[PDB]
Design an enzyme around this catalytic site. Structure first.
Site, PDB file in Angstrom:
ATOM      1  N   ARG A 193      13.683   8.536  49.861  1.00  0.00           N
ATOM      2  CA  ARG A 193      13.038   7.278  49.554  1.00  0.00           C
ATOM      3  C   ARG A 193      14.025   6.221  49.104  1.00  0.00           C
ATOM      4  O   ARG A 193      13.810   5.029  49.341  1.00  0.00           O
ATOM      5  CB  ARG A 193      11.968   7.474  48.500  1.00  0.00           C
ATOM      6  N   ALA A 225      -0.114   4.254  44.636  1.00  0.00           N
ATOM      7  CA  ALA A 225       1.262   3.816  44.435  1.00  0.00           C
ATOM      8  C   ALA A 225       1.889   4.400  43.183  1.00  0.00           C
ATOM      9  O   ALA A 225       1.316   4.306  42.089  1.00  0.00           O
ATOM     10  CB  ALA A 225       1.332   2.283  44.379  1.00  0.00           C
ATOM     11  N   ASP A 226       3.053   5.024  43.349  1.00  0.00           N
ATOM     12  CA  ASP A 226       3.770   5.572  42.196  1.00  0.00           C
ATOM     13  C   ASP A 226       4.637   4.447  41.682  1.00  0.00           C
ATOM     14  O   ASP A 226       4.530   3.322  42.182  1.00  0.00           O
ATOM     15  CB  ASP A 226       4.654   6.767  42.580  1.00  0.00           C
TER      16      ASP A 226
END
Ligand code: NA
Lengths: 118, 74, 118, 116, 74, 73
Positions: A13, B34-35
């Protein structure tokens, strides 16, 4: 506040930034952390970035406020001593001791933080 | 009005959440999955798309899509 | 501190088990945790279940005996506070403070617990 | 007083073909080897990844890492009747130690807290 | 019964790593059959289902071996 | 140095890197990206190849390739 924090962050990510990782680095790192980052190779930049994001997310968890008004990413700095042991200096933390530990796998950056009574 | 169209596209393109699921009261974290890392890329996406800067102080101040729109439009 | 504990749980493993066994969640969660689980989407569900399981495994290790005869999953309950952070109330504890931190990645749920004085 | 956390990939530790035995001799004490030999293949890789994680966590906690100031051989992990692990390390007491170890299909993880 | 044993071996083999020639009454689940915690609670659920019974976390801890389960299923 | 040649062959197989990657002043951690586990498997392979003994401390000194070559001589 007195607490503990744990955060595991997937390397992919952070790596998947390409043209966004500079802005992301600047939002996340303090002045001295950014200087270290610019000195690193590209694979090393992602690792460094994921470790700092994990350490700071963990810290904010233990601090009990999360990132925002009471705590900005810029108020937290991870430094390393002579032995390469990481510690956190935070501008918002008053009369308390902080402990941190960072570890890496091929796919992850994980950090744990303890904020204790002096 | 126009800002919701762009804001929604951002949300959809990032958090990848169905679409038509982007309501002014829709919380990014609670209702859209959403983190913390997703919300920071979201805020950054907003900073480019609208040429504004959002502090960590301000990023906390905006929980919902409507909060995003309102922040943007004034 | 009196004890600590860590647990990492595979989200896919939890997902398959719950698919394969509809009463898995009832065994792990209290009624209150269980009602909370039911209000969530199919996604949010496996991670809420995996997180609570991780937090209970970690607590049972900090407690010193693991889950079983001296401690059930039913005696441990994770609650959200004012702003949403998780904390633990355990029927078997009376003179110790308990700290918990819970984290999530795409594949894993992780938690740590510290049981200590005061 | 410090804390240590380590997460090690199980594949890498099992992946040690004929190279795993010498690796055990380096990471384990005598009391830990005896236990390791007496084990199955899968349980062996797990036992080893946990000891490695635990000793690394403990070494981070202690502040030095593995090296001149501290060796694997100085750290011993044992388990009581409840299966709770504990560390012995006559490298300067004056402190209590807490350890926790956990396993997943891919990973072996451990945390340590050394306090005053 | 000796029936309960075949129904328990079937369930173990299906569930754990085990073969079929290892479910010997003395074999511990966690130790000998490669079981971890998530494996045994599932194992317990198979049994509760396969024999219409209720097994508390307390009773789960008692049935540490293959023979323990059998005895318990009586 | 056929010593280096032998050191590189070991490093391009425990770490997987290419070749030109392994220079003499190349850092094991920063340029090769070897962690604490990689480092000990690396030191054990050298123990094997050149038949020697690298203590837990010894290994924390061989910062880069050149250093390891020097210790082997
Ligand atoms: Na690691």
């Amino acid at each position: 506040a007195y607490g503990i924090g744990l955060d595991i962050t997937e390397l992919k990510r952070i790596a998947s930034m390409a043209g966004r990782q500079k802005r992301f680095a600047e939002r996340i790192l303090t002045r001295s952390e950014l200087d270290q980052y610019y000195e690193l190779s590209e694979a090393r930049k992602n690792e460094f970035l994921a470790g700092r994001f994990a350490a700071k997310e963990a810290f904010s968890k233990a601090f009990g406020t999360g990132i925002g008004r009471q705590l900005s990413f810029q108020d937290i700095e991870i430094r390393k001593d002579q032995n390469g042991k990481p510690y956190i200096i935070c501008t918002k933390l008053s009369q308390a001791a902080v402990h941190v530990s960072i570890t890496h796998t091929k796919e992850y950056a994980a950090a744990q933080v303890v904020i204790e009574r002096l | 009005a126009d800002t919701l169209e762009r804001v929604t596209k951002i949300i959809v393109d990032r958090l990848g959440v169905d679409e038509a699921d982007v309501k002014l009261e829709a919380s990014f974290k609670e209702d859209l999955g959403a983190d913390x890392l997703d919300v920071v890329e979201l805020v950054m996406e907003l900073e480019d798309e609208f040429d504004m800067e959002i502090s960590d102080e301000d990023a906390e101040k905006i929980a919902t899509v409507g909060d995003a729109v309102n922040y943007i439009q004034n």
